[PDB]
Symmetry: D2
Subunit: 100 residues, 4 copies
């Protein structure tokens, strides 16, 4: 592929504790959902709920330091896992911990 | 209130769909295939654009055309008629870029 | 004239208190510099500029040491100085400023 | 670390400049003209495989996409010189 860009940057709050597991190849994987407030206001300020996935030390740092309600920033890519009986999620290659 | 930024460059998988709201707001939708580099080879992102940007999409973009998007990631999740939670993730394109 | 994208997103700490000025037409304009840490140089100094309501909020809520997030565009204002040498200016025109300690 | 992400799409103003470091690492610099929504002229830098691709694929006026980070750098002139550049992790361009 030529001329392909895919970049996402989000800051939000985890809706619940992150879920850490390990893949068959032993790679740690931490998942979590990020509530990101919208810019505009309707009628009430709605939010968007974005599923994120992290890998290896990134996933391990997430599991140890981030909890429900923690503020976190992610930098990564949009990835899809559509199947037939669509899924979209953020593959976060960097996670910033905005709280101590 | 919180950071939310998406930038993509890919190629439309089909011709864009255009429609005007009864009040005259143009809304155009399309799906961007973005190639990666055993694992998945590409991702397919649904995009939404409004007003002049949407009229540009409909007049200049077709299946296979190269297009770039700059916007935010939003969700429109809902509960279907069968009590099942359905997840909808889309890119609200604030700016659409294309050749010519 | 077609196919152009310009997007910057940063999180950093203000190295100094923001400076608030007003244009000849009365528009508020606030400037500030962010220290953006890296993963021998430890952080990059990036000059930011904001307008109107965003500038008012920056002036009221952000001070030296405040953590801030910016989303905007890269802009350049290069010129020729008194001695005839070109000097290059790069700054972030922030469309939105997130205050991470309100 | 903190968030620092830049994405640009523009046109090279000049042919890219290919240099090498003492240990043989390729380094390519170029300037992207990005029209405002009048244009901005942003200096970019890339390394190694990406640098080699820039050198033998991009020329004056070529369209190029950049994904990277906003950084500052030091390099003596051929006086101390300080520059603000986009460090490109990936450089995208149109199939030759």
């Amino acid at each position: 592929g030529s001329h392909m860009l895919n970049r996402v940057v989000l800051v939000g709050r985890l809706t619940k504790d992150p879920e850490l597991r390990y893949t068959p190849n032993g790679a740690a994987v931490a998942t979590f959902t990020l509530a990101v407030n919208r810019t505009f206001t309707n009628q009430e300020r709605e939010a968007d709920f974005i599923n994120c996935v992290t890998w290896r030390r990134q996933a391990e740092n997430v599991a140890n330091f981030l909890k429900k309600g923690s503020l976190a920033g992610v930098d990564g890519r949009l990835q899809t896992r559509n199947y037939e009986n669509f899924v979209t999620e953020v593959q976060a290659e960097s996670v910033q911990f905005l709280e101590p």
